[PDB]
């Protein structure tokens, strides 16, 4: 839903990289060069960002008020 | 005994060894630069200071790898996220 | 009949990780040190969350969980604070906890990101790592949604909950060339060389060393930032030494009391 | 610039002196002393004569300036000490480029005598420590003392770049290129005035530690600022002369004939032209340049190579008597330079049946690195006979090096079986078995009876 705060497998904080990840993809870094540039080496950290589906952006389409 | 030939000459093409030798540049014991502080009559830095990029790259010691994440592969693709508007 | 004399070399030291080699020593000691890095170095993490108002799209346990995993810069204060279970005071106090507040409301159209930048400590030294790069996202809020809560962080082991684990990943390796054949490759040529392989590119693995012992241990202790990476190691050695001292005290009491 | 106004006794600055002519430096001292000009004009014209490219007049006119220090100048000793600083610094600078009529000590005693008189007015100044520091480089000792005297200029008043460059040559003398390279970075950002292309020494340290991408970029810029410097051109030759495999015309012409025509009195380019011609089979010029590449050099690195070249030219001529002494001088001058002179004396001691010392001199060849050619040297000059594992072990280890590689092995298996007849008899048999057929592919030549005899034995 939202980005996990820590890579489940190892422990590296990945919860501060999602918006950075997407911004680097918007610089049109290739998808693994975004991860190489954020500093995710282990494939266990890389599958945190590659696999993450950011559904909270859809949940925020629904209005509580306004 | 077999009468082995005495190695009295260079038959071997040992020039393979002489050309590889990196002869050090020892033209002057001060490494080709005069150590003094009275000869600098002129100065480059006068307000039109000179800065060539070929000189800019020599200021660094060593800064200049692989790109194998980018490789094009027909059994592999990319990914897709959550926008706001779609089909 | 006595201890071996371990020796250390740091090969790299960043503010993220230490690489170092321990020589002599013993495989069991080196691995127990690895474990203490993972599970018994203390850090400060959020472990109490009183949610006053939450209307984010994430339910309170989810918010609380995420706050738990935010690392805190307890590089020093963790060695000062008591475990709350051991502190003699009826509530949390600044001698056994650090209070945190989060008070955010999205009163604007743009989707407000609540981040660790919004966790306000009561102690300028125990702050979320990304406050001293980007901040850890705790929630995205729509207009009119809010999240007000206060939380306390407390000292804990990575053994209790992973929130208190200080390491991102402990690399641990010994006998890089398999001279001991503790691992037995069916095809030793399909295996790439270790980072620390001393072998040439010709031969695949070191010749079997029958009388050999594992005697250099190559570490890479990567921090999650809650402690400096060299502080993880010094704190794990202190912690393991203290565990053993406590065990010895209890032993001496059990011996003398028989 | 072109002329200076002259302070006269009467009607000062109505009259001027210009430096396009080459006047006599003997009358200058008299006119400066009848006109009673101030001490400043002395150094002013000294600099102008230095702009003309004249190192001798600059140092000789300033010598008589010590007598007229403060006659009537009203306390002008500061300009006097600035005058004598040049006579305490340019003596050491000119002692290195000695001529054929003067020696080194003739300028050392003059750089040591007037330096003490220079420190009588002002001591430990921005340049006085430079003289004490560079005094140790001229004798070849006390490098830490010169480095400690160079460091003091940072704590007094480091108002120039060559005030710090002195430590990098001393870091270079102790084989510390990291500490010298870190000091040569400050030489390019400032870039003060110096005709010696201060960037040349920085391109020298980019040679080591695999920075060929940097040293070329330094030498190229030094070639574009002034093509007159040979130290930026011959360096490219020493980069390229390894590639004697393609475009060799570039190495002979662009990097050897140009450095020679612009500056033929250089033993480095003369040595390199000599070895270039050695491969060309032009021995009539190799020894003439090597004779001219030998008498002008001072450091043993170049002269040991010049004698190695001369002994190489005489060896190929079946002239080993003169080449033995040239090989001996090549190793007596510079022994830890390269493996080549040890190999030359190893191949030389074969002559006159003194092959005992060829083994001792070949031993230092393996200490650097083994060679497919050096293994057969001591294999051929093997004094191991029987029950002698001091020399047979080396023969075995050399034969294991010739056995894997195939440099047209013909007699290698013979020398294999010649040792293995005491050891397992099957190894000698396998060696003679392969040696029997290896002697038939080059020509139709029958097997000599000695091998079929040894195999039947
Ligand atoms: Zn991970
Ligand atoms: Zn308390």
Curated annotation (Swiss-Prot), chain B:
Cellular compartment(s): Nucleus
Top-rank taxon: Eukaryota
Stretch forming the signal peptide: none
Cross-link Glycyl lysine isopeptide (Lys-Gly) (interchain with G-Cter in SUMO2) residue location(s): 78
UniProt similarity note: Belongs to the PAF1 family.
Function text: Component of the PAF1 complex (PAF1C) which has multiple functions during transcription by RNA polymerase II and is implicated in regulation of development and maintenance of embryonic stem cell pluripotency. PAF1C associates with RNA polymerase II through interaction with POLR2A CTD non-phosphorylated and 'Ser-2'- and 'Ser-5'-phosphorylated forms and is involved in transcriptional elongation, acting both independently and synergistically with TCEA1 and in cooperation with the DSIF complex and HTATSF1. PAF1C is required for transcription of Hox and Wnt target genes.
Subunit structure: Component of the PAF1 complex, which consists of CDC73, PAF1, LEO1, CTR9, RTF1 and SKIC8. The PAF1 complex interacts with PHF5A. Interacts with POLR2A, TCEA1, SKIC3, KMT2A/MLL1, SUPT5H, RNF20 and RNF40. Interacts with UBE2E1. Interacts with PINT87aa which is encoded by the circular form of the long non-coding RNA LINC-PINT; the interaction enhances the binding of the PAF1 complex to target gene promoters and may anchor the complex on target gene promoters, sequentially pausing RNA polymerase II-induced mRNA elongation.
Protein name: RNA polymerase II-associated factor 1 homolog
Gene (name only): PAF1
Swiss-Prot record, chain D:
Tissues of expression: Widely expressed.
GO BP: blastocyst growth; blastocyst hatching; cell surface receptor signaling pathway via JAK-STAT; cellular response to lipopolysaccharide; endodermal cell fate commitment; inner cell mass cell differentiation; interleukin-6-mediated signaling pathway; negative regulation of gene expression, epigenetic
Oligomer and partners: Component of the PAF1 complex, which consists of CDC73, PAF1, LEO1, CTR9, RTF1 and SKIC8. The PAF1 complex interacts with PHF5A. Interacts with KMT2A/MLL1. Interacts with STAT3. Interacts with SETD5. Interacts with ERCC6. (Microbial infection) The PAF1 complex interacts with Zika virus French Polynesia 10087PF/2013 non-structural protein 5/NS5. The interaction with viral NS5 proteins may reduce the antiviral immune response by inhibiting the recruitment of the PAF1 complex to interferon-stimulated genes, thus preventing their transcription.
Sequence ranges of the TPR repeats: 39-73, 127-160, 161-194, 196-229, 233-266, 304-337, 339-372, 410-442
Location in the cell: Nucleus speckle
Alphabetic keyword roster: Nucleus, Phosphoprotein, Repeat, TPR repeat, Transcription, Transcription regulation, Wnt signaling pathway
Full protein stretch here: 3 to 459 of 1173
Annotated GO MF terms: RNA polymerase II complex binding; SH2 domain binding
A GO-annotated cellular component: euchromatin
Name assigned to this protein: RNA polymerase-associated protein CTR9 homolog
Primary role: Component of the PAF1 complex (PAF1C) which has multiple functions during transcription by RNA polymerase II and is implicated in regulation of development and maintenance of embryonic stem cell pluripotency. PAF1C associates with RNA polymerase II through interaction with POLR2A CTD non-phosphorylated and 'Ser-2'- and 'Ser-5'-phosphorylated forms and is involved in transcriptional elongation, acting both independently and synergistically with TCEA1 and in cooperation with the DSIF complex and HTATSF1. PAF1C is required for transcription of Hox and Wnt target genes.
Phylogenetic classification of the source organism: Eukaryota, Metazoa, Chordata, Craniata, Vertebrata
Primary location group: nucleus
């Amino acid at each position: 839903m939202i980005i996990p705060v820590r890579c489940f497998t190892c422990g590296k904080i990945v919860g501060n990289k999602w918006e950075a990840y997407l911004g680097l993809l918007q610089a049109e870094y290739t998808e693994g060069d975004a991860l190489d540039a954020l500093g995710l080496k282990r494939y266990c950290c890389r599958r945190m960002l590659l696999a993450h589906v950011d559904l909270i952006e859809k949940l925020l389409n629904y209005a509580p008020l306004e | 005994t077999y009468p082995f030939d005495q190695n009295r000459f260079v038959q071997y093409k040992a020039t393979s060894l002489e050309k590889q030798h990196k002869h050090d540049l020892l033209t002057e014991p001060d490494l080709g630069v005069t150590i003094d502080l009275i000869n600098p009559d002129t100065y480059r830095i006068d307000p039109n200071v000179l800065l060539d990029p070929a000189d800019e790259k020599l200021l660094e010691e060593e800064i200049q790898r692989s790109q194998q994440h980018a490789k094009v592969v027909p059994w592999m693709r990319k990914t897709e996220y959550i926008s706001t508007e779609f089909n | 009949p006595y201890a071996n004399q371990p020796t250390v070399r740091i090969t790299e030291l960043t503010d993220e990780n230490v690489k170092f080699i321990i020589e002599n020593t013993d495989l069991a000691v080196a691995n127990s040190i690895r474990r203490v890095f993972i599970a018994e170095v203390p850090i400060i993490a959020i472990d109490w969350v009183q949610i006053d108002a939450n209307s984010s799209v994430l339910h309170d346990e989810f918010i609380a969980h995420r706050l738990g995993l935010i690392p805190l810069t307890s590089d020093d204060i963790v060695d000062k604070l008591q475990y709350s279970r051991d502190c003699t005071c009826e509530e949390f106090c600044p001698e056994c906890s650090v209070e945190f507040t989060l008070d955010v409301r999205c009163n604007e159209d743009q989707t407000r990101h609540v981040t660790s930048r919004d966790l306000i400590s009561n102690s300028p030294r125990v702050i979320p790592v990304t406050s001293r790069q980007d901040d850890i996202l705790i929630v995205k809020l729509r207009k009119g949604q809010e999240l007000r809560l206060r939380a306390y962080a407390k000292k804990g082991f990575g053994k209790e909950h992973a929130k208190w684990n200080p390491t991102a990943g402990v690399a641990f390796e010994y006998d890089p060339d398999n001279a001991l054949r503790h691992t037995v490759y069916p095809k030793p040529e399909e295996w790439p060389k270790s980072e620390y392989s001393e072998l040439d590119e010709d031969e695949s693995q070191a010749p079997y060393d029958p009388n050999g012992k594992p005697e250099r241990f190559y570490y890479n202790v990567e921090s999650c930032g809650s402690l400096r990476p060299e502080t993880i190691v010094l704190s794990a050695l202190s912690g393991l030494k203290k565990k053993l001292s406590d065990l010895q005290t209890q032993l001496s009491h059990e011996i003398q009391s028989d | 610039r072109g002329s200076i106004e002259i302070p006269l006794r009467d009607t000062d600055e109505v009259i001027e002196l210009d430096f396009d002519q080459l006047p006599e430096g003997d009358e200058v001292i008299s006119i400066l002393k009848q006109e009673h000009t101030q001490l400043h004009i002395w150094i002013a014209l000294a600099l102008e004569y230095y702009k003309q490219g004249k190192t001798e007049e600059f140092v000789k006119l300033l010598e008589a300036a010590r007598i007229d220090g403060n006659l009537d100048y009203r306390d002008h000793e500061k300009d006097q000490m600035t005058c004598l600083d040049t006579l305490a610094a340019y003596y050491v600078q000119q002692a290195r480029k000695e001529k054929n009529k003067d020696n080194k000590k003739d300028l050392i005693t003059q750089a040591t005598l007037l330096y003490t008189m220079a420190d009588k007015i002002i001591m430990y100044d921005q340049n006085h420590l430079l003289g004490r520091a560079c005094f140790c480089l001229l004798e070849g000792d006390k490098m830490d003392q010169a480095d400690a005297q160079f460091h003091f200029v940072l704590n007094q008043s480091p108002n120039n770049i060559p005030a710090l460059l002195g430590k990098a040559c001393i870091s270079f003398n102790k084989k510390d290129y990291r500490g010298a390279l870190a000091y040569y970075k400050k030489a390019l950002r400032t870039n003060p005035g110096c005709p010696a292309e201060v960037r040349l020494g920085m391109g020298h340290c980019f040679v080591k530690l695999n920075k060929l991408e940097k040293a070329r970029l330094a030498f190229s810029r030094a070639l574009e600022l002034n093509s007159k410097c040979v130290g930026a051109l011959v360096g490219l030759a020493v980069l390229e002369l390894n590639n004697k495999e393609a475009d060799s015309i570039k190495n002979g012409v662009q990097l050897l004939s140009r450095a020679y025509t612009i500056d033929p009195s250089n033993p480095m380019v003369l040595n390199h032209l000599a070895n270039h011609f050695f491969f060309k089979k032009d021995y009539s010029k190799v020894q003439h340049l090597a004779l001219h590449a030998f008498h002008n050099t001072e450091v043993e690195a170049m002269q040991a190579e010049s004698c190695y070249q001369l002994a190489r030219s005489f060896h190929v001529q079946e002239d080993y008597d003169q080449a033995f002494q040239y090989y001996y001088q090549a190793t007596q001058f510079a022994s830890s330079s390269f493996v080549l002179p040890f190999f030359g004396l190893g191949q030389m001691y074969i002559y006159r049946g003194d092959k005992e010392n060829a083994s001792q001199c070949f031993e230092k060849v393996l200490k650097a690195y083994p060679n497919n050619y050096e293994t057969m040297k001591i294999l051929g000059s093997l004094y191991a006979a029987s029950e002698d594992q001091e020399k047979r072990d080396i023969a075995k280890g050399h034969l294991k090096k010739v056995t894997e590689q195939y440099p047209d092995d013909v007699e290698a298996w013979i020398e294999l079986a010649q040792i293995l007849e005491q050891t397992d008899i099957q190894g000698a048999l396998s060696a003679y078995g392969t040696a029997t057929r290896i002697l038939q592919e080059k020509v139709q030549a029958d097997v000599p009876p000695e091998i079929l005899n040894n195999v039947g034995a």
